[PDB]
Write a structure and sequence with these properties.
heterodimer; A: 221 residues; alpha+beta; Arylsulfatase, C-terminal domain; 7-stranded antiparallel sheet; 7-stranded mixed sheet; 3 helices; elongated; B: 318 residues; 2 domains; two-stranded antiparallel sheet; 12 helices; 10 strands; transferase; RNA polymerase; dimeric; Serine/threonine-protein kinase PLK4
């Protein structure tokens, strides 16, 4: 079938550059917001880069190049040589989809641990994450509590240390009278942050200038 | 919509018969003729079921055929076959067409038919490019560059802009002399800049102009200054400083890192310059990027000027 029906193109915008070394690959979010997967072979006790995929921040441009044994593994991805190949997203042949998938899952992870709207309430510190749509939402109460809202998994870490996971609103409304108002608080905070996201994103679309995200709203008392 | 005369058609035979040596890396050197390559490639592409519409000469070769000594350097001999390329097997097979045509060049050649094509690649293919995006769609195979220059074979299905400046937008459609074999037929030439007359005037008078600045790759500044070094000059001062500021803008855009700038400068100097001229070229760069700089772009250009000055100090130190 098609690649687009497997994983959507990666969204590297606004992301602070990181580098992770897994067993098989080395994934980097280059400072220019281009994702960069580089494959590794251990050979003569050294590590050599065998091929490099390099992916535009819109996930639609794939530059794949191979060295002439290959490259020694540098801290920063090896600059492209002569033998290169540019494909578009839905022209990328099946040979590469898994390698592009490493990068896509990496960026979908980084978008889940990267703040877009930080908002300080009287009772908690809210963080709407970057991975829209269906953004993660952390709520770090000054009280020591933590409420992590995902797409269907809501973990609640109490003061003691107990941590459960809420699924459906059947388990949400069933909570004791204490944590129920914690949930109400975090829900109102998430509504706030989501409305602000929509408003400021539309204003950004109008002005079309330097980015309007991330945003930080308030101070810890 | 212009036709060549005996004037340039003489140099056409002179170029398409020039004996080219391609040196190996173990492997022996190959001694080939351009017309032999074009014909043996067209033959094997037609036996694979792929339409060879146009066959064209491009690059510095077509620039030096149209005018004797315009002072550009017979460095690039480019061959363009407009070729349909929908599937990936098309590219994967054009590679094989090129290499199978490449085998037939030794007496003990088929005596070594136990040489894999990937093994054949090691000595006889230098640069190897493959683009297949939403707009562009083509493949390039270059040949070794030792004693002679680099012989490029570029099979195109759809490329958007394929000229640097006015002076190098000239293509010689080879279907005429290719059907052939005052003993000459109608050999059409064409400019990628549009109205051919104005661009050919630009070439023969050594000028610089392009009404398509939106679409230049970041490294167009480098050939702008390659032209300034070999003594070309603009046409309208109305747009020259604006144009330099556009070119510098897209340079900083397509090469943001210090080390990518440095890589491209080093790999440009070593590719285009044979026989200290590097210093004059670097000074033309310094002047262009120093004058043509918006005051806002402060340290963006400061790192680049320090870098070019360091390149120049290195050059004069060796």
């Amino acid at each position: 079938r098609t690649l687009r029906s497997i994983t959507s193109p990666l969204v590297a915008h606004r992301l602070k550059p990181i580098r992770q070394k897994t067993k098989k690959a080395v994934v980097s979010i280059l400072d220019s917001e281009e994702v960069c997967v580089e494959l590794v072979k251990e050979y003569a006790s050294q590590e050599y880069v065998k091929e490099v995929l390099q992916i535009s921040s819109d996930g639609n441009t794939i530059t794949i190049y191979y060295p002439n044994r290959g490259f020694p593994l540098a801290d920063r991805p090896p600059s492209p040589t002569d033998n290169i190949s540019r494909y578009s997203f839905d022209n990328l042949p099946e040979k590469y989809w898994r390698k592009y998938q490493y990068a896509s899952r990496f960026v979908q992870l980084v978008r889940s641990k990267s703040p877009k709207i930080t908002y300080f309430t009287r009772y908690a510190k809210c963080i709407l994450m970057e991975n829209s749509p269906g953004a993660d939402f952390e709520v770090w109460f000054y009280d020591g509590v933590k409420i992590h809202k995902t797409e269907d998994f809501i973990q609640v870490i109490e003061k003691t240390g107990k941590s459960y996971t809420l699924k459906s609103e059947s388990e949400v409304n069933s909570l004791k009278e204490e944590i129920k108002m914690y949930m109400d608080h975090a829900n109102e905070g998430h509504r706030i942050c989501l409305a602000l996201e929509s408003i400021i994103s539309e204003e950004e679309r109008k002005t079309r200038s330097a980015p309007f995200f991330p945003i930080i709203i308030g101070r810890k008392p | 919509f212009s036709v060549l005369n005996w004037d340039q058609v003489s140099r056409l035979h002179e170029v398409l018969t020039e004996v080219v040596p391609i040196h190996g890396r173990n492997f022996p050197t190959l001694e080939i003729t351009l017309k032999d390559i074009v014909q043996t490639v067209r033959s094997r592409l037609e036996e694979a079921g792929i339409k060879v519409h146009d066959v064209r000469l491009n690059g510095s070769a077509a620039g030096h055929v149209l005018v004797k000594d315009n002072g550009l350097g017979c460095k690039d001999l480019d061959l363009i076959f407009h070729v349909a390329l929908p599937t990936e097997a098309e590219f994967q097979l054009v590679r094989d067409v090129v290499l199978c045509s490449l085998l037939n060049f030794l007496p003990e050649g088929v005596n070594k038919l136990k040489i894999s094509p990937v093994t054949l690649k090691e000595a006889y293919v230098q640069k190897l490019v493959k683009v297949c995006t939403d707009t562009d769609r083509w493949s390039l195979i270059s040949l070794s560059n030792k004693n002679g220059k680099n012989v490029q074979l570029k099979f195109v299905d759809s490329i958007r802009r394929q000229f640097e400046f006015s002076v190098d937008s000239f293509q010689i459609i080879l279907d005429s002399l290719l059907d052939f074999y005052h003993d000459h037929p109608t050999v059409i030439g064409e400019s990628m800049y549009g109205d051919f007359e104005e661009a050919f005037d630009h070439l023969q008078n050594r000028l610089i102009a392009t009404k398509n600045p939106e679409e230049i790759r970041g490294g167009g500044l480098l050939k702008y200054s390659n032209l300034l070094v070999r003594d070309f000059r603009p046409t309208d001062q109305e747009e020259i400083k604006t144009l330099e500021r556009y070119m510098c803008s897209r340079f900083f855009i397509d090469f943001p890192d210090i080390l990518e700038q440095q890589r491209k400068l080093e790999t440009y100097l070593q590719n285009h310059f044979a026989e200290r001229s590097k210093y004059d070229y670097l000074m033309i760069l310094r002047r262009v990027v120093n004058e043509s700089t918006v005051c806002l772009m402060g340290h963006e250009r400061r790192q680049t000027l320090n870098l070019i000055s360091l390149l120049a100090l290195r050059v004069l130190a060796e």
